[PDB]
Amino acid sequence: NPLVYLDVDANGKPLGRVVLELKADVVPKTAENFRALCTGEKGFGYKGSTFHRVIPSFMCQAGDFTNHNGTGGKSIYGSRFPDENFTLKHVGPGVLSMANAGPNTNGSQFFICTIKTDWLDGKHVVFGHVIEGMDVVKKIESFGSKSGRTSKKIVITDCGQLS
Ligand SMILES: NCCOCCNC(=O)[C@@H]1CCNC(=O)CCC(=O)N2CCC[C@](Cc3ccccc3)(C2)C(=O)N[C@@H](Cc2ccc(-c3ccc(CCC(=O)O)cc3)cc2)C(=O)NCc2ccccc2CC(=O)N1
């Protein structure tokens, strides 16, 4: 399974690195989309974009590199793409899952859970998990709010593939 990284800052101050294992063994098409958006190999992707909605005791959401507000993004497949499967569950903190606007509306937006979000099982495609840097995720979460607006600008300053 590929390993990718997000290096995250808050108001320009580095918070550290999040390492994500992508479950290409279960959701290869969803894992590949995220991998390529981390490397930037198609000329666009996550680098320089933000965590735009962060809600404590819920999740940290990112990947809207077109509109920066939860309405946009772009997949590597030319259009919104189907839910590959709902095999993996939102079991706890550190789960990496696709944001969407209903069935079969996957793009580039994603979230990292900070609790078990079991009510999303069967609705959002889980495709990976944090293996290093959960403390960075908790730092991101600490800048969230009830509305999801962040108290500092949280940026993916760099991202890419490790292996
Ligand atoms: N329920 C029990 C108790 O739970 C309490 C905890 N709160 C919960 O469980 C809560 C409760 C319900 N609350 C909510 O849904 C919050 C919703 C919200 O913030 N927004 C703000 C932002 C825009 C809105 C409305 C919209 C959608 C679409 C376009 C324009 C406006 C609404 C929204 O929906 N945007 C989605 C992300 C999103 C992903 C992908 C795309 C997209 C895909 C493909 C392409 C082209 C690809 C190509 O061409 O290549 C382009 C775009 C667009 C939008 C959003 O944010 N979805 C919500 C969400 C995200 C992540 C995880 C979970 C959730 C559910 C949640 O948060 N649910």
Author numbering: 45 to 207
What is the paper's account of this structure, in its own sentences?
A key structural feature shared among all cyclophilin isoforms is a shallow and highly conserved PPIase active site. Adjacent to the active site is the S2 pocket, a distinct exo-site that forms part of a long substrate-binding groove for peptides. In particular, three gatekeeper residues (positions 123, 124, and 145 in CypD) and one far S2 pocket residue (position 118 in CypD) are highly diverse among cyclophilins.
While retaining the same interactions with CypD as B2, we also observed a novel hydrogen bond with the backbone of S119 and a salt bridge with the side-chain of K118, which is usually oriented away from the S2 pocket. CypD K118A and CypD K118E are less potently inhibited by B23 and B25 (B23, IC50CypD(K118A) = 0.07 μM, IC50CypD(K118E) = 0.18 μM; B25, IC50CypD(K118A) = 0.019 μM, IC50CypD(K118E) = 0.06 μM) than wild-type CypD (B23, IC50CypD = 0.0078 μM; B25, IC50CypD = 0.003 μM), consistent with the role of a salt bridge with K118 in enhancing CypD potency and selectivity. We reasoned that S123 can better tolerate the carboxylate on B23 in comparison to a negatively charged Glu at this position in CypB. Migration of the S123 loop in the B23–CypD structure compared to B2–CypD suggests that this conformational shift must be tolerated for any cyclophilin bound to B23. Indeed, other cyclophilins with Glu at the 123 position (CypA, CypB, CypC, Cyp40) show weaker inhibition by B23 compared to CypD. Selectivity for CypD was further improved by installing carboxylates (B23, B25) that can hydrogen bond with S119 and K118, achieving selectivity over non-lysine-containing PPIL1, Cyp40, CypC, and PPWD1.
